[PDB]
Protein backbone atom coordinates (compact mmCIF):
# COMPACT_ATOMS: atom_id res chain seq x y z
CA UNK A 1 0.00 0.00 0.00
CA UNK A 2 3.15 2.15 0.17
CA UNK A 3 2.45 3.85 3.49
CA UNK A 4 5.82 4.19 5.19
CA UNK A 5 9.26 2.87 5.98
CA UNK A 6 12.85 3.97 5.77
CA UNK A 7 13.54 6.03 2.66
CA UNK A 8 17.17 6.96 1.88
CA UNK A 9 17.50 10.58 0.81
CA UNK A 10 20.24 9.82 -1.73
CA UNK A 11 22.60 7.07 -2.86
CA UNK A 12 25.02 7.57 0.03
CA UNK A 13 22.30 6.66 2.56
CA UNK A 14 21.51 3.24 1.07
CA UNK A 15 24.06 1.79 3.52
CA UNK A 16 22.03 2.97 6.53
CA UNK A 17 19.65 -0.03 6.43
CA UNK A 18 20.28 -3.72 5.66
CA UNK A 19 17.25 -4.03 3.39
CA UNK A 20 18.33 -1.06 1.28
CA UNK A 21 21.87 -2.45 1.26
CA UNK A 22 20.53 -5.62 -0.35
CA UNK A 23 18.42 -3.47 -2.68
CA UNK A 24 21.40 -1.46 -3.90
CA UNK A 25 23.41 -4.65 -4.34
CA UNK A 26 20.60 -6.02 -6.50
CA UNK A 27 20.43 -2.78 -8.50
CA UNK A 28 24.17 -3.01 -9.04
CA UNK A 29 23.80 -6.55 -10.34
CA UNK A 30 20.92 -5.52 -12.60
CA UNK A 31 22.67 -2.51 -14.13
CA UNK A 32 26.11 -4.12 -14.34
CA UNK A 33 24.93 -7.21 -16.17
CA UNK A 34 24.24 -4.99 -19.19
CA UNK A 35 27.83 -3.74 -19.74
CA UNK A 36 28.98 -7.33 -19.33
CA UNK A 37 26.60 -8.39 -22.10
CA UNK A 38 27.82 -5.51 -24.28
CA UNK A 39 31.44 -6.61 -23.86
CA UNK A 40 30.74 -10.32 -24.25
CA UNK A 41 28.32 -10.24 -27.19
CA UNK A 42 30.11 -7.50 -29.17
CA UNK A 43 33.58 -9.01 -28.81
CA UNK A 44 35.94 -9.05 -31.78
CA UNK A 45 36.64 -12.77 -31.42
CA UNK A 46 32.96 -13.73 -31.31
CA UNK A 47 32.09 -15.83 -34.36
CA UNK A 48 28.72 -16.95 -35.68
CA UNK A 49 28.14 -20.68 -35.79
CA UNK A 50 29.18 -22.06 -39.20
CA UNK A 51 26.22 -24.47 -39.07
CA UNK A 52 23.73 -21.75 -38.09
CA UNK A 53 21.91 -22.37 -41.38
CA UNK A 54 21.68 -26.12 -40.76
CA UNK A 55 18.76 -25.64 -38.37
CA UNK A 56 16.82 -22.79 -36.81
CA UNK A 57 13.79 -22.34 -34.59
CA UNK A 58 11.97 -20.68 -37.49
CA UNK A 59 11.79 -23.91 -39.49
CA UNK A 60 10.97 -25.93 -36.36
CA UNK A 61 7.93 -23.93 -35.25
CA UNK A 62 6.77 -23.33 -38.83
CA UNK B 1 -25.76 52.98 11.94
CA UNK B 2 -25.33 49.34 10.86
CA UNK B 3 -28.10 49.44 8.26
CA UNK B 4 -29.97 46.12 8.63
CA UNK B 5 -29.83 44.51 5.21
CA UNK B 6 -33.31 44.01 3.82
CA UNK B 7 -32.65 40.35 3.08
CA UNK B 8 -31.87 39.72 6.75
CA UNK B 9 -35.55 40.19 7.62
CA UNK B 10 -36.31 37.16 5.42
CA UNK B 11 -35.06 34.23 7.48
CA UNK B 12 -36.31 31.66 4.93
CA UNK B 13 -32.93 31.30 3.25
CA UNK B 14 -32.23 28.93 0.36
CA UNK B 15 -30.97 25.46 1.28
CA UNK B 16 -28.01 24.72 -1.00
CA UNK B 17 -26.38 21.29 -0.86
CA UNK B 18 -22.64 20.67 -0.96
CA UNK B 19 -21.26 18.70 -3.90
CA UNK B 20 -19.53 15.95 -1.92
CA UNK B 21 -22.53 15.22 0.30
CA UNK B 22 -24.21 11.80 0.18
CA UNK B 23 -27.26 11.42 -2.01
CA UNK B 24 -30.83 11.45 -0.70
CA UNK B 25 -33.79 9.99 -2.59
CA UNK B 26 -36.54 12.61 -2.41
CA UNK B 27 -40.23 11.94 -3.06
CA UNK B 28 -41.51 15.55 -3.03
CA UNK B 29 -40.38 18.91 -4.38
CA UNK B 30 -40.77 22.15 -2.42
CA UNK B 31 -42.41 24.57 -4.86
CA UNK B 32 -42.46 28.32 -4.17
CA UNK B 33 -44.63 30.21 -6.68
CA UNK B 34 -44.65 34.02 -6.65
CA UNK B 35 -46.54 36.70 -8.59
CA UNK B 36 -45.69 40.42 -8.48
CA UNK B 37 -44.07 39.94 -5.07
CA UNK B 38 -46.91 37.78 -3.74
CA UNK B 39 -46.49 34.04 -3.19
CA UNK B 40 -49.31 31.60 -3.94
CA UNK B 41 -47.53 28.51 -2.57
CA UNK B 42 -45.17 28.42 0.42
CA UNK B 43 -42.66 25.57 0.01
CA UNK B 44 -45.55 23.34 -0.99
CA UNK B 45 -44.62 19.65 -1.43
CA UNK B 46 -45.58 18.58 -4.96
CA UNK B 47 -44.91 15.55 -7.12
CA UNK B 48 -43.75 17.51 -10.16
CA UNK B 49 -43.97 20.88 -11.90
CA UNK B 50 -44.06 21.55 -15.65
CA UNK B 51 -42.70 24.92 -16.81
CA UNK B 52 -42.31 26.25 -20.37
CA UNK B 53 -38.96 28.01 -20.66
CA UNK B 54 -37.42 29.66 -23.69
CA UNK B 55 -35.74 26.59 -25.18
CA UNK B 56 -38.68 24.30 -24.48
CA UNK B 57 -40.73 22.59 -21.82
CA UNK B 58 -39.22 21.25 -18.60
CA UNK B 59 -40.67 18.67 -16.25
CA UNK B 60 -39.07 19.24 -12.86
CA UNK B 61 -39.18 16.33 -10.40
CA UNK B 62 -37.48 15.97 -7.01
CA UNK B 63 -33.71 15.82 -7.25
CA UNK B 64 -33.55 17.77 -10.51
CA UNK B 65 -30.13 19.26 -11.17
CA UNK B 66 -29.50 22.86 -10.20
CA UNK B 67 -30.50 25.16 -13.05
CA UNK B 68 -31.87 28.58 -14.01
CA UNK B 69 -34.72 28.87 -16.51
CA UNK B 70 -35.93 32.04 -18.24
CA UNK B 71 -39.65 31.50 -18.64
CA UNK B 72 -41.82 32.65 -21.55
CA UNK B 73 -45.53 33.49 -21.65
CA UNK B 74 -47.09 30.07 -21.17
CA UNK B 75 -49.05 27.72 -18.88
CA UNK B 76 -47.49 26.14 -15.81
CA UNK B 77 -48.63 22.84 -14.31
CA UNK B 78 -48.24 21.50 -10.77
CA UNK B 79 -49.04 17.85 -10.03
CA UNK B 80 -49.24 16.82 -6.38
CA UNK B 81 -48.36 13.40 -5.00
CA UNK B 82 -52.07 12.94 -4.24
CA UNK B 83 -52.87 13.04 -7.96
CA UNK B 84 -54.26 16.56 -8.33
CA UNK B 85 -53.23 18.96 -11.10
CA UNK B 86 -53.28 22.75 -10.73
CA UNK B 87 -52.66 24.93 -13.78
CA UNK B 88 -51.63 28.58 -13.83
CA UNK B 89 -50.60 30.86 -16.68
CA UNK B 90 -47.49 33.05 -16.45
CA UNK B 91 -46.34 35.97 -18.60
CA UNK B 92 -42.64 35.75 -17.79
CA UNK B 93 -39.97 35.55 -15.13
CA UNK B 94 -37.42 33.06 -13.89
CA UNK B 95 -37.45 29.61 -12.32
CA UNK B 96 -34.64 28.45 -10.03
CA UNK B 97 -34.20 24.68 -9.62
CA UNK B 98 -32.08 23.40 -6.74
CA UNK B 99 -30.58 19.92 -6.46
CA UNK B 100 -31.60 19.97 -2.76
CA UNK B 101 -35.26 19.56 -3.72
CA UNK B 102 -36.58 23.11 -4.11
CA UNK B 103 -38.02 25.02 -7.07
CA UNK B 104 -38.76 28.75 -6.85
CA UNK B 105 -40.82 30.17 -9.72
CA UNK B 106 -40.94 33.96 -9.42
CA UNK B 107 -43.06 35.37 -12.24
CA UNK B 108 -44.15 38.92 -12.99
CA UNK B 109 -47.77 37.77 -13.30
CA UNK B 110 -49.14 34.30 -12.50
CA UNK B 111 -52.91 33.83 -12.80
CA UNK B 112 -55.15 30.77 -12.84
CA UNK B 113 -55.90 29.47 -16.32
CA UNK B 114 -59.59 29.47 -15.37
CA UNK B 115 -59.57 33.23 -14.71
CA UNK B 116 -58.70 33.76 -18.38
CA UNK B 117 -61.41 33.92 -21.04
CA UNK B 118 -61.43 32.82 -24.67
CA UNK B 119 -63.60 35.42 -26.41
CA UNK B 120 -61.64 38.24 -24.77
CA UNK B 121 -58.43 36.78 -26.20
CA UNK B 122 -59.99 36.43 -29.66
CA UNK B 123 -61.16 40.04 -29.90
CA UNK B 124 -57.86 41.34 -28.53
CA UNK B 125 -55.98 39.23 -31.07
CA UNK B 126 -58.08 40.68 -33.89
CA UNK B 127 -57.47 44.24 -32.68
CA UNK B 128 -53.71 43.67 -32.45
CA UNK B 129 -53.67 42.16 -35.95
CA UNK B 130 -55.55 45.20 -37.27
CA UNK B 131 -53.18 47.55 -35.43
CA UNK B 132 -50.12 45.65 -36.69
CA UNK B 133 -50.71 46.89 -40.23
CA UNK B 134 -51.06 50.45 -38.92
CA UNK B 135 -47.93 50.14 -36.78
CA UNK B 136 -46.23 53.52 -36.44
CA UNK B 137 -42.71 52.13 -36.84
CA UNK B 138 -40.63 48.98 -36.34
CA UNK B 139 -40.84 49.20 -32.54
CA UNK B 140 -44.64 49.25 -32.65
CA UNK B 141 -44.64 46.18 -34.91
CA UNK B 142 -42.41 44.29 -32.49
CA UNK B 143 -44.59 45.30 -29.54
CA UNK B 144 -47.73 44.15 -31.35
CA UNK B 145 -46.01 40.89 -32.28
CA UNK B 146 -45.17 40.37 -28.60
CA UNK B 147 -48.80 41.01 -27.66
CA UNK B 148 -50.05 38.70 -30.42
CA UNK B 149 -47.70 35.91 -29.34
CA UNK B 150 -48.90 36.15 -25.73
CA UNK B 151 -52.53 36.02 -26.83
CA UNK B 152 -51.88 33.05 -29.11
CA UNK B 153 -50.17 31.20 -26.25
CA UNK B 154 -53.13 31.90 -23.97
CA UNK B 155 -55.59 30.70 -26.61
CA UNK B 156 -53.55 27.55 -27.23
CA UNK B 157 -53.44 26.79 -23.51
CA UNK B 158 -57.21 27.23 -23.21
CA UNK B 159 -57.92 25.04 -26.25
CA UNK B 160 -55.61 22.30 -24.98
CA UNK B 161 -57.92 21.71 -22.00
Amino acid sequence: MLLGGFVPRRFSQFNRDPCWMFFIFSVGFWLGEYPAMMIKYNARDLVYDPHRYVWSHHDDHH
Amino acid sequence: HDLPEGFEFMEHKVVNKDIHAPHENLETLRLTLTRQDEFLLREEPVKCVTVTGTNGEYGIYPGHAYKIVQLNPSPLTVEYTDGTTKKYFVSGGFAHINNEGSCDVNTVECTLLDDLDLAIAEKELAAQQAALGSAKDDKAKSVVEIRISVIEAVIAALKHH
Binding site: - | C48, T50, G56, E57, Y58, G59, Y61
Partner: protein
Protein backbone atom coordinates in the same frame (compact mmCIF):
# COMPACT_ATOMS: atom_id res chain seq x y z
CA UNK C 1 -21.57 -4.19 -42.50
CA UNK C 2 -24.76 -2.31 -43.39
CA UNK C 3 -26.13 -3.52 -40.04
CA UNK C 4 -23.49 -1.36 -38.35
CA UNK C 5 -25.30 1.73 -39.61
CA UNK C 6 -28.63 0.24 -38.53
CA UNK C 7 -27.85 -0.85 -34.98
CA UNK C 8 -26.08 2.45 -34.37
CA UNK C 9 -29.06 4.34 -35.76
CA UNK C 10 -31.39 2.54 -33.35
CA UNK C 11 -29.18 3.47 -30.41
CA UNK C 12 -29.32 7.11 -31.48
CA UNK C 13 -33.13 7.05 -31.41
CA UNK C 14 -33.24 5.58 -27.90
CA UNK C 15 -30.49 7.90 -26.68
CA UNK C 16 -32.56 10.91 -27.70
CA UNK C 17 -35.66 9.23 -26.26
CA UNK C 18 -34.14 9.18 -22.77
CA UNK C 19 -33.31 12.89 -22.99
CA UNK C 20 -36.78 13.61 -24.37
CA UNK C 21 -38.37 11.58 -21.56
CA UNK C 22 -36.16 13.24 -18.94
CA UNK C 23 -37.45 16.61 -20.23
CA UNK C 24 -41.19 15.88 -20.63
CA UNK C 25 -41.89 12.56 -18.87
CA UNK C 26 -45.65 13.14 -19.09
CA UNK C 27 -45.29 12.76 -22.88
CA UNK C 28 -43.49 9.41 -22.60
CA UNK C 29 -46.49 7.44 -23.85
CA UNK C 30 -46.47 9.57 -27.02
CA UNK C 31 -42.70 9.69 -27.56
CA UNK C 32 -42.35 5.93 -27.11
CA UNK C 33 -44.73 5.26 -30.00
CA UNK C 34 -42.70 7.55 -32.27
CA UNK C 35 -39.50 5.86 -31.09
CA UNK C 36 -40.97 2.48 -32.04
CA UNK C 37 -41.89 3.90 -35.45
CA UNK C 38 -38.27 4.88 -36.08
CA UNK C 39 -37.10 1.40 -35.09
CA UNK C 40 -39.68 -0.08 -37.47
CA UNK C 41 -38.07 1.84 -40.35
CA UNK C 42 -34.36 1.41 -39.62
CA UNK C 43 -34.93 -2.30 -38.97
CA UNK C 44 -36.70 -2.57 -42.33
CA UNK C 45 -33.54 -1.25 -44.00
CA UNK C 46 -31.54 -3.93 -42.20
CA UNK C 47 -33.80 -6.59 -43.69
CA UNK C 48 -32.78 -5.56 -47.21
CA UNK C 49 -29.11 -6.00 -46.31
CA UNK C 50 -29.97 -9.27 -44.56
CA UNK C 51 -31.86 -10.43 -47.66
CA UNK C 52 -28.76 -9.94 -49.83
CA UNK C 53 -26.62 -11.58 -47.15
CA UNK C 54 -28.89 -14.63 -47.44
CA UNK C 55 -29.41 -14.74 -51.21
CA UNK C 56 -25.66 -14.70 -51.88
CA UNK C 57 -24.95 -17.04 -48.95
CA UNK C 58 -27.29 -19.64 -50.52
CA UNK C 59 -26.59 -19.06 -54.22
Amino acid sequence: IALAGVGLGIGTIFGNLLVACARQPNLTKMLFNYAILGFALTEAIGLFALMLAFLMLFS
